[PDB]
Design a binder for this molecule. Structure first.
Ligand SMILES: *[C@@H]1O[C@H](CO)[C@@H](O[C@@H]2O[C@H](CO)[C@@H](O[C@@H]3O[C@H](CO[C@H]4O[C@H](CO)[C@@H](O)[C@H](O)[C@@H]4O)[C@@H](O)[C@H](O[C@H]4O[C@H](CO)[C@@H](O)[C@H](O)[C@@H]4O)[C@@H]3O)[C@H](O)[C@H]2NC(C)=O)[C@H](O)[C@H]1NC(C)=O
Ligand SMILES: *[C@@H]1O[C@H](CO)[C@@H](O[C@@H]2O[C@H](CO)[C@@H](O[C@@H]3O[C@H](CO[C@H]4O[C@H](CO)[C@@H](O)[C@H](O)[C@@H]4O)[C@@H](O)[C@H](O[C@H]4O[C@H](CO)[C@@H](O)[C@H](O)[C@@H]4O)[C@@H]3O)[C@H](O)[C@H]2NC(C)=O)[C@H](O)[C@H]1NC(C)=O
Ligand SMILES: *[C@@H]1O[C@H](CO)[C@@H](O[C@@H]2O[C@H](CO)[C@@H](O[C@@H]3O[C@H](CO[C@H]4O[C@H](CO)[C@@H](O)[C@H](O)[C@@H]4O)[C@@H](O)[C@H](O[C@H]4O[C@H](CO)[C@@H](O)[C@H](O)[C@@H]4O)[C@@H]3O)[C@H](O)[C@H]2NC(C)=O)[C@H](O)[C@H]1NC(C)=O
Ligand SMILES: *[C@@H]1O[C@H](CO)[C@@H](O[C@@H]2O[C@H](CO)[C@@H](O)[C@H](O)[C@H]2NC(C)=O)[C@H](O)[C@H]1NC(C)=O
Ligand SMILES: *[C@@H]1O[C@H](CO)[C@@H](O[C@@H]2O[C@H](CO)[C@@H](O)[C@H](O)[C@H]2NC(C)=O)[C@H](O)[C@H]1NC(C)=O
Ligand SMILES: *[C@@H]1O[C@H](CO)[C@@H](O[C@@H]2O[C@H](CO)[C@@H](O)[C@H](O)[C@H]2NC(C)=O)[C@H](O)[C@H]1NC(C)=O
Ligand SMILES: *[C@@H]1O[C@H](CO)[C@@H](O[C@@H]2O[C@H](CO)[C@@H](O)[C@H](O)[C@H]2NC(C)=O)[C@H](O)[C@H]1NC(C)=O
Ligand SMILES: *[C@@H]1O[C@H](CO)[C@@H](O[C@@H]2O[C@H](CO)[C@@H](O)[C@H](O)[C@H]2NC(C)=O)[C@H](O)[C@H]1NC(C)=O
Ligand SMILES: *[C@@H]1O[C@H](CO)[C@@H](O[C@@H]2O[C@H](CO)[C@@H](O)[C@H](O)[C@H]2NC(C)=O)[C@H](O)[C@H]1NC(C)=O
Ligand SMILES: *[C@@H]1O[C@H](CO)[C@@H](O)[C@H](O)[C@H]1NC(C)=O
Ligand SMILES: *[C@@H]1O[C@H](CO)[C@@H](O)[C@H](O)[C@H]1NC(C)=O
Ligand SMILES: *[C@@H]1O[C@H](CO)[C@@H](O)[C@H](O)[C@H]1NC(C)=O
Ligand SMILES: *[C@@H]1O[C@H](CO)[C@@H](O)[C@H](O)[C@H]1NC(C)=O
Ligand SMILES: *[C@@H]1O[C@H](CO)[C@@H](O)[C@H](O)[C@H]1NC(C)=O
Ligand SMILES: *[C@@H]1O[C@H](CO)[C@@H](O)[C@H](O)[C@H]1NC(C)=O
Ligand SMILES: *[C@@H]1O[C@H](CO)[C@@H](O)[C@H](O)[C@H]1NC(C)=O
Ligand SMILES: *[C@@H]1O[C@H](CO)[C@@H](O)[C@H](O)[C@H]1NC(C)=O
Ligand SMILES: *[C@@H]1O[C@H](CO)[C@@H](O)[C@H](O)[C@H]1NC(C)=O
Ligand SMILES: *[C@@H]1O[C@H](CO)[C@@H](O)[C@H](O)[C@H]1NC(C)=O
Ligand SMILES: *[C@@H]1O[C@H](CO)[C@@H](O)[C@H](O)[C@H]1NC(C)=O
Ligand SMILES: *[C@@H]1O[C@H](CO)[C@@H](O)[C@H](O)[C@H]1NC(C)=O
Ligand SMILES: *[C@@H]1O[C@H](CO)[C@@H](O)[C@H](O)[C@H]1NC(C)=O
Ligand SMILES: *[C@@H]1O[C@H](CO)[C@@H](O)[C@H](O)[C@H]1NC(C)=O
Ligand SMILES: *[C@@H]1O[C@H](CO)[C@@H](O)[C@H](O)[C@H]1NC(C)=O
Lengths: 173, 317, 317, 173, 173, 317
């Protein structure tokens, strides 16, 4: 949320994108298409797997401890045994609550970040050949067939090839 | 005409609600549970060495109640005490019971070594109808009830050195008869104190004659004591009656052993984490099954669910 | 010519300083305090049931010191013990005092039920000038001082079964006379032991004759003991003198009750959190009033202030 | 601070904005005006209220515990009672300190974020009709009367209406 | 990482920049040069020093406590003494682990932020006289000698001086 | 032609690996260690007042074993007990030893004030060959072994008021002879109890005659007890034999003092944090040297290293 893309300027997610977490939809002379972006997808996944690696399968061994249930009333010593355990449980419960709240805030933010980073990268790549429509979409001011769209998605788009055409279309009356 | 290129992200039709710093309910695409809240209900017999107490408490297995003879010299990682367990020998109490139970549980062995105590002048091997072993009157297997020999009980002053390289745990007791008649019948004299000592310790106990409410028809009692004897130290037992003598010592070890109260069945299965409700998986960092645990276990918390987001905010079409 | 459009944010003339991860002093537009640091100084009488001990400790109210007769059979959520409290009956001590005080505090009741003990052969209802109740010599209301009948004190062997469905708490005592004369005058024989037993427990105590420094002119002492008797068990009292007998039992409950030492006045007001300094509001998560608390209370911390930002960085003109 | 708007490229706050936390000032042919932006304001407020909802009015009930003050010297048992309590208090004091420091860092950042998001939204909306002056202000290169400014603040500004006028003004010599 | 500059659109760091943490390299008619940016450098340093001030030289005094090693077997009381200490140590160990992980995530992010902020400031300053090449570099479309580059680094660059020249170079065919 | 202006950041050839929330290994330009893991191995004698016990335990210095005479009336912040320490006086035990050791350690003083007890009718200053002080038979310096005077030991009933404004700590003992002969030789009568009392407390102890295993050729024992007497209260000692009497009282203070077991040498140096391994620097927030600490110390953790990033991600050319 803090970057402003996911649940922000991107109006909604795409239920029909099932082969990645982030990607591109386009419309050009040859149709309307969708493609996943693998690098951004893997960047988010790697970070979340990093959190999982620090939480899952990491337990501590304990053996003989103190008693925690009692059949008889005893007074002072038992009051202390119970208080030590209640103290411990409340501290661990607090740690667990905070851990999940913080980690979840951070996951939502880092995933929003990866969306924003992909958007920014694409904006820069297009140079003077496109304009940002405000909703995560670019209007590209030149003929941009499937190979051209592919070149943008693959980082091989040469903006100089199309710049004269695009400037003429952008700055007409 | 030109083209349009739109950047976007996935969504799912079945998102899950998580908590964050700023919102107690936000939908993400996926999450995972961090609190283990279930058990199958069995204590797995692997990989920890489990000893099912069955009808025996640990202390009854220690002293040698006749239903506990199968426990002799056994070891455990976890001794499991059942709520149905009951005693069926001479009625006894243990001042500090919890501490004796704890130190034996933690030692993890009932390894016992007989020793040749010099009990010259008394009758050994006293038995009772309150402690039946194969229809015969009997007594605790690890204790030696000494009584008069030909209406004489001379002063005992009996020594046992520890020339081993480990510590020895001695268990012994004092008999409190129900009446003055019983005192005379058993020990041939008025009661007097028992003193058990070493170079570093001394315990003296006074037999107290009198009726207690009958337990399995017995108004007398035995009180149980223990003494640890270090290498190069010496046990000394000084009595003129009422002594329930040791037959030898228990080895005392250190390690990972403990004891748990549970009525869960033991299963043929493999699980690292044991609770009184049964073994639990230990993939998750937390659990709300039981504060009582043994082994590699998640940490007990009060929450029954804690969902960790594993995907982005879910923003459906 | 055209236009200018400027984006901006508010500020205030009176910002507040907070701490962050990277700066111990940064000004924000607004903040809220997370540490409760004040009390009005009164313990609110609602919504917890408060019992002001006034001149009585809980143990004095238990035994039945004559200034504590108004406390009979009362219950509490919180018993408040005052620093001015003092005893004005026969001088006594309680081995383990802290534990008896704790278990009665936690039970939360002084509900007492008289029972008909068979004290045939002795004089009941002994009184003393050290325990005045309405100008008359008296004694603890819940205890029964037994003495000789016609210069005889026969051996007592007195039973009381628990055929109730709850546990019974018995309070009893041993009298330690100041001299051998006093021993003979009261019990008509040389001192001997008292044994109080059940099926699961035994306590024997030895009266020890001798002068202690006088307290309200009394060089003797009473020592107080207690015994819990479970359903279907039986209290047995065996004495030949020096017995301060129970008159019955206290009910023992479990629940939310406790005890607190405080000199704060009780007020007609409503507050969920009690400390010895008075009740405190419980809106905040933390407090630095007192580590001792009862009820729904903020957690005690060492900080006297912790300010949570509730607005942006303040960047004044 | 981490986004760079509040206490960054926005030189200072506005003490005279009392009906919102974020907003717009403008100058055009009809005068100089100020208006609060309600959506950004409410977004920040909602997040802070989320934190408050997790901290205020949420206490734990405790009843009988252990004693914490002592009139007599006793040794081992009392040493343990005191150590348990001192241990507990230090852990809770640590938790409180960290909680406030982290939450405050985050509040400053999320409020900075909401300012940046409003700025970015406005920049995109204006398309080729304005330029960013670097200080949170846009120079708008066409006549933009009160209704026009209102249309920008309400999200109904049609950049195509003014584009010819604006391009002519921007790209003159 | 979360802003996307350091280890993102900036391909790598500069081992030959030893007099600051952030800065500028340029090429113009007079050569290729490097200069550190002191304000961004000091901003990052100040934040890290803020963390250090809250962690270094801040210890707690403790005096008489409980025993923590034992020569004899004792049972219940010793079991409780050991459990209290083991409990405490595990809670502090957890606090230490989390503290370092969170603080380090935040340090990497705040340093990335300072790089991004400097880049954004420079982009705005250049107005219509330069274009972002996508790799942290700007192509400046006018003659920009050493004093000119200096003016950009010092915040005294007047974009209006060069705008006619730059627009002519940018929007040619 | 124009120009190019590139924004960038530094890097180093020798980066350091740290842990984060999302990656257990990421290289940054610089980091600092937060866990202190070393000591020089000496306990610094400044700025805390250190008392090296040398051959003496604190309790031996208290009672006044002849090797501990140099300790009289000394104070400490930290008493250092060495593993080589041994006792060389009359063999003794202390029920609750750990508590007496703790309360004296915490008080931080051995300040002793002699008092004139009225021991009329007995022989004072008993000595033994098991406690040699300058080749002469001797005894604990702070204790007074009382024996018969002309084959008489009359009943002692001896008082000592506390008219000071502070509390007094009295240390005293009971002698347990090895035989009935020894009992008669020393006290001229059969053994009987010792009762030490105040207005608020009473302790009675029974001498128990019998052989214990010999320690430095002595089969008898002394058992050590203590009593605290508050202002305006009174110590009363009642004995007919077997009394090891106090010679006066110790002052009891409150403050920052403690005790530590260590074999580390004391050095001429200045360090605020002491562990049994030696003093440690306290710049870092955490340490893994020892859970046992005294002074302004980092907190003990299990980790041996925790690296805090102090620079950006390192992204080398
Ligand atoms: C929502 O988000 C979660 C978390 O990221 C995803 O859950 C993970 O899903 C993957 C893929 O299915 C799981 O990977 C598999 O793990 C198995 C281990 O299972 C147990 O052990 C772990 C810890 O020890 C427990 O946490 C877990 O609950 C199980 O009890 C492996 O046995 C699997 O191996 C299979 O694939 C490998 C490929 O090499 C082969 O070698 C094997 O033959 C075998 O067939 C596999 O590695 C992972 O465990 C899940 N993690 C958690 C924490 O649950 C969900 O997939 C995701 N949901 C959606 C819709 O995206
Ligand atoms: C600086 O930031 C803080 C925190 O955001 C703001 O403080 C809040 O201010 C609001 C508006 O005044 C408060 O709302 C009111 O709360 C009352 C409850 O008061 C007590 O109870 C809570 C917890 O139980 C305590 O935290 C609190 O300190 C009090 O002891 C309600 O009774 C009020 O009700 C009134 O309005 C409602 C409207 O529906 C009516 O129903 C009622 O008739 C009544 O008149 C109201 O809800 C809120 O409690 C404050 N929170 C805190 C934590 O203090 C400051 O306003 C802000 N300052 C500035 C200048 O912006
Ligand atoms: C990697 O990152 C770390 C942390 O930011 C840097 O370490 C700091 O380096 C500075 C500069 O050298 C150090 O500053 C010096 O501190 C001395 C105190 O030393 C001890 O005390 C502290 C705490 O009490 C301990 O943490 C520390 O380890 C030492 O045991 C001062 O005595 C120094 O004073 C000198 O300069 C001043 C200037 O006014 C003069 O007054 C004096 O005459 C004297 O010559 C100085 O202040 C700082 O202590 C370091 N901090 C830590 C935590 O280690 C590394 O420099 C950095 N590495 C790189 C390559 O960038
Ligand atoms: C003291 O009283 C108890 C209880 O009344 C006596 O024990 C009972 O004795 C009868 C007769 O022998 C038995 O049938 C009961 O089973 C016993 N009851 C209990 C509760 O134990 C006891 O005998 C009396 N003691 C003496 C010495 O006479
Ligand atoms: C595991 O066992 C414990 C047994 O005590 C269960 O906790 C008890 O639950 C009952 C209600 O079912 C409560 O009345 C008790 O207060 C609980 N006891 C204690 C001591 O807290 C627990 O529910 C079981 N958990 C599972 C998952 O089976
Ligand atoms: C033992 O000594 C105490 C203290 O000297 C005696 O108690 C005092 O007795 C006198 C005379 O009866 C009283 O007036 C005092 O009030 C008592 N003082 C205290 C402090 O209690 C006690 O009487 C002596 N014991 C015996 C058996 O003679
Ligand atoms: C609440 O009561 C406690 C009573 O102990 C106060 O804490 C004591 O404060 C005095 C100084 O005023 C110190 O000398 C003591 O060391 C404190 N006692 C303890 C046991 O820590 C406390 O100040 C009171 N708080 C308020 C807000 O009234
Ligand atoms: C009880 O037995 C012990 C141990 O056998 C006796 O103590 C030994 O006595 C001999 C002869 O005097 C000494 O040389 C030994 O050094 C003693 N051994 C130990 C281990 O102390 C003791 O004398 C006997 N008691 C009685 C009263 O006869
Ligand atoms: C400081 O002293 C303690 C002394 O106990 C050291 O910890 C022990 O280390 C040995 C191995 O060297 C282990 O076998 C023991 O289990 C440890 N003892 C305890 C009680 O945990 C510690 O290594 C020393 N540290 C330094 C830095 O010198
Ligand atoms: C872009 O990359 C994909 C990778 O699968 C490839 O199939 C496609 O042909 C590429 N297109 C262009 C235009 O480079
Ligand atoms: C959604 O449905 C799929 C397929 O049925 C399932 O595998 C997945 O776990 C579900 N996700 C959530 C978040 O419930
Ligand atoms: C345990 O005791 C019960 C009833 O007392 C008996 O039926 C059962 O056979 C005993 N089991 C074992 C294993 O000894
Ligand atoms: C006592 O019983 C044991 C164990 O069966 C036996 O070996 C021993 O010979 C018996 N000794 C005496 C003296 O009765
Ligand atoms: C201990 O044994 C010795 C030697 O036989 C004897 O004199 C003494 O009475 C015994 N002591 C006790 C307390 O039984
Ligand atoms: C600032 O002043 C107003 C009005 O007097 C007051 O309500 C508010 O709480 C003050 N804010 C701070 C942060 O002190
Ligand atoms: C409490 O005791 C004091 C003085 O001993 C007395 O004046 C007062 O009346 C008593 N109060 C009550 C409520 O009994
Ligand atoms: C003892 O006093 C009680 C309480 O007033 C009374 O009911 C009872 O009759 C008295 N009994 C004897 C035997 O004195
Ligand atoms: C207990 O009572 C019985 C029966 O009257 C008697 O024989 C015995 O002496 C009493 N015991 C004590 C210790 O008083
Ligand atoms: C913008 O919205 C406000 C909402 O109050 C409205 O009053 C105003 O007339 C609107 N202006 C335009 C130009 O849409
Ligand atoms: C920029 O600032 C530096 C500061 O050292 C100065 O030396 C340099 O001459 C300045 N250059 C310009 C062009 O302003
Ligand atoms: C890198 O090397 C320098 C110079 O040798 C040294 O001062 C610095 O501490 C080293 N940094 C790291 C992170 O190892
Ligand atoms: C300590 O004792 C040893 C051996 O018993 C002796 O050699 C040494 O001189 C003694 N040291 C002191 C300081 O008394
Ligand atoms: C006992 O010894 C002390 C200490 O040297 C001495 O002052 C005193 O006179 C002696 N008293 C008797 C009665 O022997
Ligand atoms: C206490 O001293 C008094 C008075 O001399 C005496 O009668 C009594 O026997 C003594 N008591 C003991 C237990 O020694």
């Amino acid at each position: 949320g803090i970057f402003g893309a996911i649940a922000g300027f991107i109006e909604n997610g795409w239920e029909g994108m099932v082969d990645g977490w982030y990607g591109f939809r386009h419309q050009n002379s040859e149709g309307i298409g969708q493609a996943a972006d693998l690098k951004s997808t893997q960047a988010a996944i790697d970070q979340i797997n990093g959190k999982l690696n620090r939480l899952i399968g990491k337990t501590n061994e304990k053996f003989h401890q103190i008693e925690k249930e009692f059949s008889e009333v005893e007074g002072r010593i038992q009051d202390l045994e119970k208080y030590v355990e209640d103290t411990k449980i409340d501290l661990w419960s607090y740690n667990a609550e905070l851990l999940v709240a913080l980690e979840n805030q951070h996951t939502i933010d880092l995933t929003d970040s990866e969306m924003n980073k992909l958007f920014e990268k694409t904006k820069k790549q297009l140079r003077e050949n496109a304009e940002d429509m405000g909703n995560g979409c670019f209007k590209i001011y030149h003929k941009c067939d499937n190979a051209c769209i592919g070149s943008i998605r693959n980082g091989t788009y040469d903006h100089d090839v199309y710049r004269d055409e695009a400037l003429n279309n952008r700055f007409q009356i | 005409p030109g083209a349009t290129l739109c950047l976007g992200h996935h969504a799912v039709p079945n998102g899950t609600i998580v908590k964050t710093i700023t919102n107690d309910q936000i939908e993400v695409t996926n999450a995972t549970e961090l609190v283990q809240s279930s058990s199958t209900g069995e204590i797995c017999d692997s990989p920890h060495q489990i000893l099912d107490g069955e009808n025996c408490t640990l202390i009854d297995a220690l002293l040698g109640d006749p239903q506990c003879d199968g426990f002799q010299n056994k070891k455990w990682d976890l001794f499991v005490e059942r709520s149905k367990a009951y005693s069926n020998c001479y009625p006894y109490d243990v001042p500090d019971y919890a501490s004796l139970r704890s130190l034996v549980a933690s030692s993890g062995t009932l390894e016992f070594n007989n020793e040749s105590f010099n009990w010259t002048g008394v009758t050994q091997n006293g038995t009772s109808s309150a402690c039946i072993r194969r229809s015969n009157n009997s007594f605790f297997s690890r204790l030696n009830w000494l009584t008069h020999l030909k209406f004489k009980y001379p002063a005992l002053n009996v020594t046992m050195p520890n020339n081993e390289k480990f510590d020895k745990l001695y268990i012994w007791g004092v008999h409190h008869p129900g009446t003055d008649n019983d005192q005379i019948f058993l020990y041939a004299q008025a009661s007097g104190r028992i003193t058990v000592s070493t170079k570093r310790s001394q315990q003296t106990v006074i037999p107290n004659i009198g009726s207690r409410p009958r337990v399995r028809n017995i108004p007398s009692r035995i009180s149980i004591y223990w003494t640890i004897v270090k290498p190069g130290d010496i046990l000394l037992i000084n009595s003129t009656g009422n002594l329930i003598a040791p037959r030898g010592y228990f080895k005392i070890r250190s390690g990972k052993s403990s004891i748990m109260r549970s009525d869960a069945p033991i299963g043929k299965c493999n699980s690292e984490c044991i609770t009184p409700n049964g073994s639990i998986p230990n993939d998750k960092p937390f659990q709300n099954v039981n504060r009582i645990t043994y082994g590699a276990c998640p940490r007990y918390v009060k929450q029954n669910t804690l969902k960790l987001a594993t995907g982005m905010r879910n923003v459906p079409e």
